[PDB]
Design a protein around this ligand. Structure first.
Ligand SMILES: [Zn+2]
Length: 189
């Protein structure tokens, strides 16, 4: 969001949330690009998750999270580690969050300059990003839930999560197989 027309699309997605009808405020506004919309909300979801998890970092440590889990996850990003290897959740989130940032920082995928079409493979990249972000949601719901309830960050995470699930559901960016944890939750909302 160079502060340009995406910034508006961002302030779009944010402001329209006040309706309280999430199944609507997440749809493509009339005559807007799908890839652009997905890109903008993908970024805001990245920032929201990064900040939210940032609150509980002290409660998520190498001791507190021997593994990323509820369901276990091992970081094989891609190119850099082809063989999935287990590690601590703090290491895992650090790993993936940097990876998601690099996705957002690569103009082949997320261009700043307008008029440049998104890559043809895009929305495979976006779908991947959002599944990995959902895992961060999952860690925070399963193990540190009270660590928030006690903290001041509580209804923020459920609001952002409800936004997340409603959005990805509208656009089919996350497989139901990946929503297996919290499945009890995508049902409530
Ligand atoms: Zn943890």
């Amino acid at each position: 969001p160079e502060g340009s027309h995406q910034y508006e699309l961002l302030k779009h997605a944010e402001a329209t949330l006040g309706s309280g009808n999430l199944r609507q405020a997440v749809m493509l506004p009339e005559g807007e690009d799908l890839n652009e919309w997905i890109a903008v909300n993908t970024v805001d979801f990245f920032n929201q998750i990064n900040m939210l998890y940032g609150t509980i970092t002290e409660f998520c440590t190498e001791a507190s999270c021997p593994v990323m889990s509820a369901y276990e996850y091992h970081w094989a990003d891609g190119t850099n580690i082809k063989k999935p290897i287990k590690c601590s959740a703090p290491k895992y989130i650090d790993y993936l969050m940097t990876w998601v940032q690099d996705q957002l920082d690569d103009e082949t995928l997320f261009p700043s300059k307008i008029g440049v079409p998104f890559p043809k493979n895009f929305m495979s990249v976006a779908k991947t990003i959002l599944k990995r972000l959902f895992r961060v949601y999952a860690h925070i719901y399963h193990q540190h839930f009270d660590s928030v309830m006690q903290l001041e960050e509580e209804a923020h995470l459920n609001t952002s999560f409800k936004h997340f699930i409603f959005f990805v559901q509208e656009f089919n960016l996350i497989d139901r197989r990946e929503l297996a944890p919290l499945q009890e939750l995508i049902e409530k909302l």
